[PDB]
Amino acid sequence: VLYVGSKTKEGVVHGVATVAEKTKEQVTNVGGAVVTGVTAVAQKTVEGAGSIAAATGFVKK
Amino acid sequence: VLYVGSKTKEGVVHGVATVAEKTKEQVTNVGGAVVTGVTAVAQKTVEGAGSIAAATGFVKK
Amino acid sequence: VLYVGSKTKEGVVHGVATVAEKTKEQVTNVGGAVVTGVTAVAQKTVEGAGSIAAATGFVKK
Amino acid sequence: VLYVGSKTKEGVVHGVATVAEKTKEQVTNVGGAVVTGVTAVAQKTVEGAGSIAAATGFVKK
Amino acid sequence: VLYVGSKTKEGVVHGVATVAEKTKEQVTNVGGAVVTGVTAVAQKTVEGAGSIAAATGFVKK
Amino acid sequence: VLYVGSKTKEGVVHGVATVAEKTKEQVTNVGGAVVTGVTAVAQKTVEGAGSIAAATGFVKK
Numbered sequence: 001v002l003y004v005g006s007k008t009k010e011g012v013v014h015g016v017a018t019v020a021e022k023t024k025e026q027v028t029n030v031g032g033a034v035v036t037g038v039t040a041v042a043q044k045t046v047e048g049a050g051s052i053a054a055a056t057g058f059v060k061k
Numbered sequence: 062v063l064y065v066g067s068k069t070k071e072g073v074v075h076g077v078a079t080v081a082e083k084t085k086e087q088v089t090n091v092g093g094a095v096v097t098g099v100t101a102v103a104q105k106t107v108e109g110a111g112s113i114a115a116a117t118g119f120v121k122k
Numbered sequence: 123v124l125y126v127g128s129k130t131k132e133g134v135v136h137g138v139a140t141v142a143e144k145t146k147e148q149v150t151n152v153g154g155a156v157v158t159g160v161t162a163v164a165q166k167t168v169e170g171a172g173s174i175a176a177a178t179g180f181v182k183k
Numbered sequence: 184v185l186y187v188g189s190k191t192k193e194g195v196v197h198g199v200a201t202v203a204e205k206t207k208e209q210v211t212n213v214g215g216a217v218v219t220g221v222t223a224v225a226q227k228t229v230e231g232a233g234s235i236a237a238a239t240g241f242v243k244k
Numbered sequence: 245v246l247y248v249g250s251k252t253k254e255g256v257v258h259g260v261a262t263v264a265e266k267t268k269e270q271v272t273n274v275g276g277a278v279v280t281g282v283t284a285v286a287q288k289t290v291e292g293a294g295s296i297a298a299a300t301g302f303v304k305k
Numbered sequence: 306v307l308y309v310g311s312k313t314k315e316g317v318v319h320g321v322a323t324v325a326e327k328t329k330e331q332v333t334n335v336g337g338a339v340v341t342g343v344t345a346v347a348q349k350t351v352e353g354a355g356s357i358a359a360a361t362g363f364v365k366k
Contacts, residue, residue, distance in 0.1 A: 156198065173235075234295045
């Protein structure tokens with residue numbers, strides 16, 4: 001069981017950002033969900049057998 | 062079981078961003094769902110046998 | 123079971139962005155759903171046998 | 184079971200954007216559904232045997 | 245079972261965009277459905293045996 | 306079972322866009338359905354044996 005309630009005058013929200021200037025070889029990486037707001041809720045569940053996930057940047061051989 | 066309620070005068074929201082200037086070889090990577098708003102809710106469930114996910118940037122052999 | 127309710131005077135929302143100037147070799151990558159709004163809700167469920175997902179940027183041999 | 188309700192005077196929304204200037208070799212990639220609005224709802228279910236999905240940018244041999 | 249209800253005086257919405265100037269070799273890619281409006285709803289289901297989906301940008305041999 | 310209902314005075318909506326100026330070799334790609342309006346609803350189901358779907362940009366052999 002989960003309950004959320006709110007009352008608000010003003011909200012300003014910035015979730016994720018990146019800046020790169022003049023650089024070489026740069027990575028921004030986030031391995032899960034991104035959830036953003038004046039009210040925000042997130043949930044995840046994992047079960048099963050051998051269930052698998054991944055994320056990756058640059059590769060050079 | 063989940064309940065949400067909210068009341069607001071004003072809201073401003075910016076979810077995900079990236080700036081790259083003059084650079085070489087740049088990656089922004091996000092491995093799950095993106096959810097953005099004045100009110101936001103997200104849910105995920107995983108089960109089963111051998112169930113598999115992935116994401117990747119540049120590759121060079 | 124899920125319930126959402128809201129009341130608002132004003133809302134302004136920007137979900138996902140990318141800016142690249144004068145650069146070489148750039149990637150923006152997102153491995154799931156994108157959901158955006160003044161009210162926003164997202165759900166996913168995964169089961170089965172051998173069920174598989176993927177995403178990828180540039181590749182060079 | 185899902186219930187949503189909302190009341191709003193004014194709303195402004197931008198889902199996904201991309202800008203590239205004077206650049207070489209740029210990729211914007213999203214591996215799932217894109218949903219945008221003043222009110223937004225999204226749902227997905229995956230089952231079966233060997234069910235598969237994918238997405239890809241530039242490829243060079 | 246899904247229920248949605250909403251009331252609004254004024255609404256403005258922009259779904260997906262891409263801008264490219266003087267650039268060379270650019271790709272905007274989305275692997276699923278695109279849904280946009282003042283009220284937006286989406287649903288997807290996948291089952292069966294060996295069922296497959298895909299998407300791709302430029303390819304060069 | 307799905308239910309949607311709404312009342313609105315004014316609404317403005319733009320679904321998908323692209324701008325390319327002085328550029329060379331550019332691709333915009335969407336692997337699913339496109340739905341746009343003041344109210345928007347979408348549904349898809351996939352089953353069977355060996356069922357296949359696809360989409361692709363420029364190819365050079």
